[PDB]
Structure 1
Amino acid sequence: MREIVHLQAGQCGNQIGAKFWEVISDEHGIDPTGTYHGDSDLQLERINVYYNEATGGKYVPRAVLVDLEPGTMDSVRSGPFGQIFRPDNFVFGQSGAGNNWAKGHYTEGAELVDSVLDVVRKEAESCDCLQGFQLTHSLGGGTGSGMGTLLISKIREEYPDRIMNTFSVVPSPKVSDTVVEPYNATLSVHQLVENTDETYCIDNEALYDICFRTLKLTTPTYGDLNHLVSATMSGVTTCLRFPGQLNADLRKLAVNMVPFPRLHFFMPGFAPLTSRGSQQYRALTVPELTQQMFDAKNMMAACDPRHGRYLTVAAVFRGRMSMKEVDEQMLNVQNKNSSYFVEWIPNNVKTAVCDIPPRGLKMSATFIGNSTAIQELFKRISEQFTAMFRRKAFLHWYTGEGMDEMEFTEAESNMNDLVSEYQQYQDATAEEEGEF
């Protein structure tokens, strides 16, 4: 009754969401061939949120896979759960963007979107009451950061009064995988601020130290990194498809952590993360969840809120759970840390509780925190953008494709106006009106 349309962009998008369509298939009890093999009866009560009915009592995901290269189209299909997607939803071009945002936005991605919008309009109009769209992509590439942001600009004009979610993978200061990473990052965050309802900032180096220091894995391959972000994507939508005591969908969260339309950058986190050697040394009750959830080690963005200021905080719980300790722990963490929170918003924490735990676990929680310290990310990108733009460096790949020199100037000016906006909300005055 409240459908979510999934769409995936780039090699990063098609390898993150492929894990995402495997974790909720196990949650709802779906084998790789498609049919239902489970024990509970409320697993089929809300399955139309992510699945479409097919003949013979099997189900297909309501997702589309978008790329500019057939390299990972051939690999996602050949995966474990690769035979569950509809083969008509695979759309791919024959020439890659090649880590170039201009090719992804103006030259190579300007013709594929004529085919992508037909598929996503076909999938969205069948829904009786659409909730919104959900996109996974990375800003460090060409086909995810270039064409994926053009899909956002086209869908927002077509469907204005809907919900847009972006689980964007922002660049990291230390991995340094691509030389032109600040160019693709600067030109895409400028587009992301104007036509997006909710944005989550996933960083790769903040996923590396969790798998090294918290989870204690010897080899943290990309299968383990994508399980972390898929657990957050499943936990943010758990009140939509599973019953509970206090429910909250995406729209009820979006109206509470977004006080101004330009303030929609969030910080994900997943609380029950323990290793085999320490899973018997500690219990996992509600105090232990909220002790690890607010901890800066657990957070999925590579910038510390201890240097910042919490604007608004969310927390969605799972499993059959008492109400009094949930409210007690949330009130206690606000009252003791009286300096890390804003003062012009009282009761910064919004709470939801679901009754169905994730598989293999009895109790769980997730974190969504809108913080002022996210401006550390944009200033770090800006100083690398403005360092290499003084020299006309790497411009002949961009300005040779119909791009002027003024797009880079306005992309950094509005981004500089963005960090000036976040700063004044942090240092806003106390108990005083204005000239308004």
Structure 2
Amino acid sequence: PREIITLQLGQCGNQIGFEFWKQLCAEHGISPEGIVEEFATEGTDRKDVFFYQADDEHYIPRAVLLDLEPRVIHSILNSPYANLYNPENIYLSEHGGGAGNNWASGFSQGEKIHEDIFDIIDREADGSDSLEGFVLCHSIAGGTGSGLGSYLLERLNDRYPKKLVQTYSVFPNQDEMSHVVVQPYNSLLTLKRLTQNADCVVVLDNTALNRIATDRLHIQNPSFSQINQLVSTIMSASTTTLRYPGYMNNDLIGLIASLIPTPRLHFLMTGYTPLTTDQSVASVRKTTVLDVMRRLLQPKNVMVSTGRDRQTNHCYIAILNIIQGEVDPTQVHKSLQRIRERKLANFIPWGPASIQVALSRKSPYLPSAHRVSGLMMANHTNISSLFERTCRQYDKLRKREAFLEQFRKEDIFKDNFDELDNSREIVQQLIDEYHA
């Protein structure tokens, strides 16, 4: 019916998808090894849209996880949520990889394991006779998720041409350049494949993570154990129309169709306010829906590093405001009434704009059926500031003679560096041209 195959790949893409499947059992009322609660069918009306359909009421995840590093998968099998995963769909015990840290490693390893990489991931494709598409849950940081992920964006474009492609990709961190220095090279090589060899992306910045991780979360030493908490909730938040029973844009080709203006303009800004557990003691007094979307357009919950004074000459075109759970829908048109009076979104002068609001009932659970949740999927034309940030860090590195002799020994014979530079400037010029 609407079966999606997630493509978890890389050192960071496997960990953000590990707790994504772990989030799904707590809201479906199911255990990874059994069914102890009856809340799975009376409370939740649809479960076989991301999981594989049941053979013994055991909803297998439709997931594949490949990585060169064996460290990310050795921290999985000792956890009690790995018995839900199957040891025959992806790998058996003692799976390995390369050495290995290179973008050209996984780019060259795709055609030497070409027979095996297109054998076991295609067995899940013909399980349903109407496949939705493929989401590449991969990474941009490092050479593991960026090297091999650029290969599958090409060969799955023609072997599966009538399928939706759209990824939840995480952006790397640009604070210092000591541990990694190959960051401007492997990022722009995948970013070219994300626009012409891929339809849509969902950007997730790393410098904007610790802006939120010290905002309300109150940590002193930033660890990697907090990167899975902001990411796994908004992943399950994006499929609330798709997993839980909704009516309009209840498919993944429903939501993405109403937000993309044009190809190579698909970078969607994400926002999510409620992350604090001591808000729970004051939501008993009928906290309404009239105050939760006034702060979405206000740049506080954003996960995109952008300029603060560059929003006057940029214009919103498509903005999504997803409320979940208890909505009190007699005032949801009242919340959309107050949008035109502030004009917090700059509107495009050539065409109409749209503020789309939708709702779906959440899990039968006490932290879910009590507190209001707001998921934002914006589309603003100030996203070229990240593309100006990455390009200015790209041409400055090529004048310092950095990784021009250390990178072209394997499988690179011609200069494909300006092939990425002009196509990035094509994106940056057509964005500002789009508001005439």
Aligned-pair Cα RMSD in Å: 2.4
1:32 aligns with 2:32: yes
Residue 98 (structure 2) aligns with: 95
Question: Does the CA-based 8 Å contact 2:45-2:245 persist in structure 1?
Answer: no
Distance in 1 (alpha carbons) for counterparts of 2:413 and 2:333: 54
Taking structure 2 as the reference length, what is the TM-score of the superposition? 0.89
- AA aligned opposite 2:431: Y
Residue 214 (structure 2) aligns with: 212
Residue 252 (structure 2) aligns with: 250
The offset of 1:392, in angstroms, is 3.3
Question: Does the CA-based 8 Å contact 1:289-1:365 persist in structure 2?
Answer: yes
1:410 aligns with 2:419: yes
Distance in 1 (alpha carbons) for counterparts of 2:335 and 2:308: 19
Taking structure 1 as the reference length, what is the TM-score of the superposition? 0.89
Distance in 2 (alpha carbons) for counterparts of 1:97 and 1:322: 53
Distance in 2 (alpha carbons) for counterparts of 1:239 and 1:326: 17
Question: Does the CA-based 8 Å contact 1:199-1:265 persist in structure 2?
Answer: yes
Distance in 2 (alpha carbons) for counterparts of 1:59 and 1:349: 36
Please give the residue correspondences for 1:232-251 in structure 2 after superposition, counting only pairs within 5 Å: 232-244=234-246, 246-251=248-253
SS class of match (2:113):
helix
Deviations 1:6-54 (A, max 9, x none): 1111010111000101001111122132445342524564222122245
Distance in 2 (alpha carbons) for counterparts of 1:358 and 1:232: 18
- AA aligned opposite 2:170: V
1:390 aligns with 2:399: yes
1:297 aligns with 2:300: yes
- AA aligned opposite 1:134: V
The offset of 1:55, in angstroms, is 4.5
Higher helix share: 1
SS class of match (2:256):
helix
50-59 vs 403-412, which deviates more?
Answer: 50-59
Distance in 2 (alpha carbons) for counterparts of 1:8 and 1:103: 18
Taking structure 1 as reference, are residues 389 and 337 closer, same or farther at Cα in structure 2, changes over 3 Å only? Answer: same
Please give the residue correspondences for 1:32-431 in structure 2 after superposition, counting only pairs within 5 Å: 32-35=32-35, 37-42=37-42, 45-53=45-53, 55-91=55-91, 93-98=96-101, 100-105=102-107, 107-174=108-175, 176=177, 178-217=180-219, 221-244=223-246, 246-276=248-278, 279-280=280-281, 284-304=287-307, 307-308=310-311, 309-337=315-343, 340-357=346-363, 359=365, 360-362=367-369, 363-425=372-434, 428-429=435-436
Residue 432 (structure 1) aligns with: none
Q: How many residues align?
A: 424
- AA aligned opposite 2:343: N
1:15 aligns with 2:15: yes
Distance in 1 (alpha carbons) for counterparts of 2:195 and 2:188: 11
The offset of 1:358, in angstroms, is 7.8
Question: Does the CA-based 8 Å contact 1:257-1:313 persist in structure 2?
Answer: yes
Taking structure 1 as reference, are residues 43 and 74 closer, same or farther at Cα in structure 2, changes over 3 Å only? Answer: farther
Deviations 1:213-267 (A, max 9, x none): 1333556543332121111111111111212465532212222111111111111
409-418 vs 215-224, which deviates more?
Answer: 215-224
- AA aligned opposite 2:182: V
SS class of match (1:144):
helix
344-353 vs 382-391, which deviates more?
Answer: 344-353
Taking structure 1 as reference, are residues 385 and 335 closer, same or farther at Cα in structure 2, changes over 3 Å only? Answer: same
Distance in 2 (alpha carbons) for counterparts of 1:166 and 1:79: 27
Distance in 2 (alpha carbons) for counterparts of 1:184 and 1:118: 27
Question: Does the CA-based 8 Å contact 2:44-2:244 persist in structure 1?
Answer: no
Residue 433 (structure 1) aligns with: none
Taking structure 1 as reference, are residues 40 and 275 closer, same or farther at Cα in structure 2, changes over 3 Å only? Answer: closer
Taking structure 1 as reference, are residues 306 and 321 closer, same or farther at Cα in structure 2, changes over 3 Å only? Answer: farther
Distance in 2 (alpha carbons) for counterparts of 1:249 and 1:108: 34
Taking structure 1 as reference, are residues 103 and 397 closer, same or farther at Cα in structure 2, changes over 3 Å only? Answer: farther
Question: Does the CA-based 8 Å contact 2:46-2:245 persist in structure 1?
Answer: no
Deviations 1:169-200 (A, max 9, x none): 11233254521101011111011101222201
Distance in 2 (alpha carbons) for counterparts of 1:268 and 1:2: 24
SS class of match (2:225):
helix
- AA aligned opposite 1:144: G
Taking structure 1 as reference, are residues 240 and 326 closer, same or farther at Cα in structure 2, changes over 3 Å only? Answer: same
Distance in 2 (alpha carbons) for counterparts of 1:358 and 1:112: 44
Deviations 1:374-402 (A, max 9, x none): 11111111111101112431123321112
Q: Note the residue ranges of structure 1 that are not aligned, 5 or more in a row.
A: 430-436
Q: Note the residue ranges of structure 2 that are not aligned, 5 or more in a row.
A: none
Taking structure 1 as reference, are residues 271 and 194 closer, same or farther at Cα in structure 2, changes over 3 Å only? Answer: same
Distance in 1 (alpha carbons) for counterparts of 2:364 and 2:186: 36
Taking structure 1 as reference, are residues 285 and 423 closer, same or farther at Cα in structure 2, changes over 3 Å only? Answer: same
Question: Does the CA-based 8 Å contact 1:135-1:167 persist in structure 2?
Answer: yes
Distance in 2 (alpha carbons) for counterparts of 1:58 and 1:47: 11
Taking structure 1 as reference, are residues 112 and 292 closer, same or farther at Cα in structure 2, changes over 3 Å only? Answer: farther
SS class of match (2:4):
strand
Taking structure 1 as reference, are residues 20 and 236 closer, same or farther at Cα in structure 2, changes over 3 Å only? Answer: same
The offset of 1:138, in angstroms, is 1.5
Residue 434 (structure 1) aligns with: none
